[PDB]
Amino acid sequence: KVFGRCELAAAMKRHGLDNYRGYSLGNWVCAAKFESNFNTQATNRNTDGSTDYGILQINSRWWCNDGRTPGSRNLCNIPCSALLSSDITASVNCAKKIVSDGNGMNAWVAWRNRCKGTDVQAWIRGCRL
Numbered sequence: 001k002v003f004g005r006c007e008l009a010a011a012m013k014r015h016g017l018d019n020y021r022g023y024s025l026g027n028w029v030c031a032a033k034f035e036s037n038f039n040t041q042a043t044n045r046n047t048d049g050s051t052d053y054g055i056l057q058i059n060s061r062w063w064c065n066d067g068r069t070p071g072s073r074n075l076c077n078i079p080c081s082a083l084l085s086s087d088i089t090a091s092v093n094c095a096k097k098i099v100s101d102g103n104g105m106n107a108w109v110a111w112r113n114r115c116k117g118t119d120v121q122a123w124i125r126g127c128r129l
């Protein structure tokens with residue numbers, strides 16, 4: 001499913017991302033826009049053979065199992081396909097684990113290059129939250 005901007009903001013707020021580990025909601029909506037264009041079914045393969053899955057492009061080397069990434073950990077204990085669902089619960093729950101790992105939202109390269117240090121409140125402007 002492809003979310004609208006405010007629809008995703010509301011869903012993320014309901015699942016407890018607003019100010020999670022100090023990251024306001026706009027940071028999570030900006031990261032989803034530039035990682036997946038708000039598409040839950042986005043996938044992208046990387047040079048190392050791992051693949052990134054879903055609205056927040058979560059990687060199979062560390063976080064989920066896709067059966068084709070040798071030596072990967074599956075820290076979120078989920079098949080990577082669960083991250084492609086129209087229900088974003090599994091992606092949010094795994095993202096909370098990733099943002100707690102020590103480097104905060106710098107784990108998402110699009111957030112660091114396209115959202116960090118910008119006016120991220122713009123991503124939630126106008127929305128009924």
Ligand SMILES: [Cl-]
Pocket residue numbers: 109110113114
């Ligand atoms: Cl980037």
